[PDB]
Amino acid sequence: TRWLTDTEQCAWRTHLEVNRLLTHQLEKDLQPFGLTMNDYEILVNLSESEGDRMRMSDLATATMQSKSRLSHQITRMENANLVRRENCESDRRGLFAVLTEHGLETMRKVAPHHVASVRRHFIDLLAPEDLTELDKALKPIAEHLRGQ
Amino acid sequence: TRWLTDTEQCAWRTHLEVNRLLTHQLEKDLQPFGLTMNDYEILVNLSESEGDRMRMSDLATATMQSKSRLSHQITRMENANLVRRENCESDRRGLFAVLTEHGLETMRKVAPHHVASVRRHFIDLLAPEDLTELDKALKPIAEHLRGQ
Numbered sequence: 001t002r003w004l005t006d007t008e009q010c011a012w013r014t015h016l017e018v019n020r021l022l023t024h025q026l027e028k029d030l031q032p033f034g035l036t037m038n039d040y041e042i043l044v045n046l047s048e049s050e051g052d053r054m055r056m057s058d059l060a061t062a063t064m065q066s067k068s069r070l071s072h073q074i075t076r077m078e079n080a081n082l083v084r085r086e087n088c089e090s091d092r093r094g095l096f097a098v099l100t101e102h103g104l105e106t107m108r109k110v111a112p113h114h115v116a117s118v119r120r121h122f123i124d125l126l127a128p129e130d131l132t133e134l135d136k137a138l139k140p141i142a143e144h145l146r147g148q
Numbered sequence: 149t150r151w152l153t154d155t156e157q158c159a160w161r162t163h164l165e166v167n168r169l170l171t172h173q174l175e176k177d178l179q180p181f182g183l184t185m186n187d188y189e190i191l192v193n194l195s196e197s198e199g200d201r202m203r204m205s206d207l208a209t210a211t212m213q214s215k216s217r218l219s220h221q222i223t224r225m226e227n228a229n230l231v232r233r234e235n236c237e238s239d240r241r242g243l244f245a246v247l248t249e250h251g252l253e254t255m256r257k258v259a260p261h262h263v264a265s266v267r268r269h270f271i272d273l274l275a276p277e278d279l280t281e282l283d284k285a286l287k288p289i290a291e292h293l294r295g296q
């Protein structure tokens with residue numbers, strides 16, 4: 001068994017501590033808007049797409065979740081009038097998710113607070129050099145994990 | 149509003165993607181042992197404490213969660229005979245979470261596999277320089293988040 005060295009262990013535990021604490025903190029900061037981070041991430045992905053809409057299978061890939069889990073989540077967001085589903089007449093490759101105007105306005109309301117939170121708890125705490133170096137180091141990890 | 153620059157946004161999204169994918173993968177690798185990552189984190193904290201026990205209030209602080217959330221998790225682990233709650237005779241009254249013999253054996257069985265997983269999905273994918281850098285860059289973010 002190759003136990004972690006002191007240097008490896010420290011890096012691993014710092015990563016894990018930041019991951020856990022940051023996820024909690026960002027969720028906490030969205031709570032007053034009645035949104036989960038999962039909700040917010042869908043709003044962002046849709047708003048950055050042409051026509052504010054995406055094929056469900058492409059949205060599933062972008063949010064790294066199963067067809068069935070995304071479907072449940074979209075039903076929840078539909079019930080909150082944030083998104084709607086649309087049929088495709090021309091093929092059988094599935095439904096589109098589309099942002100509603102209420103979804104758009106919700107995004108526009110929350111985004112400034114979310115960006116301020118991301119900055120105060122993370123981005124503004126990193127030197128530009130460390131940000132770049134972190135990104136170059138972590139990109140291949142994302143790639144490995146996406147493949148896995 | 150100071151919107152994220154392109155460089156900041158790319159880095160931020162890579163951090164999010166890695167945090168999410170890595171948590172999912174490590175949870176998946178623990179599944180054959182019947183353990184969640186929350187379970188495992190408590191096993192680790194207890195096994196690294198003197199006497200393989202910790203005061204519940206210290207354990208809440210160490211895992212950065214509320215008294216009520218920890219309590220629900222400990223109940224689950226107690227039902228699984230991994231930990232016991234005990235008002236241990238002590239000079240300072242207080243409730244302890246105590247690793248059971250089954251907890252300790254479970255830890256000894258699972259730890260080698262978990263370390264192999266942490267290596268294959270993360271640690272063995274990082275150059276020594278990026279490991280040092282991760283640690284130096286992220287420590288102040290962990291500090292900030294703990295202070296919240």
Ligand SMILES: O=C(O)c1ccccc1O
Pocket residue numbers: 013016185188189190192193262266
């Ligand atoms: O999953 C881990 O390896 C770990 C390490 C330190 C503290 C809590 C944890 O879950």
Ligand SMILES: [Cl-]
Pocket residue numbers: 049050051052
């Ligand atoms: Cl558009």
Ligand SMILES: [Cl-]
Pocket residue numbers: 197198199200
């Ligand atoms: Cl000990």
Ligand code: NA
Pocket residue numbers: 046047048049050051052
């Ligand atoms: Na758009």
Ligand code: NA
Pocket residue numbers: 194195196197198199200
């Ligand atoms: Na110990």
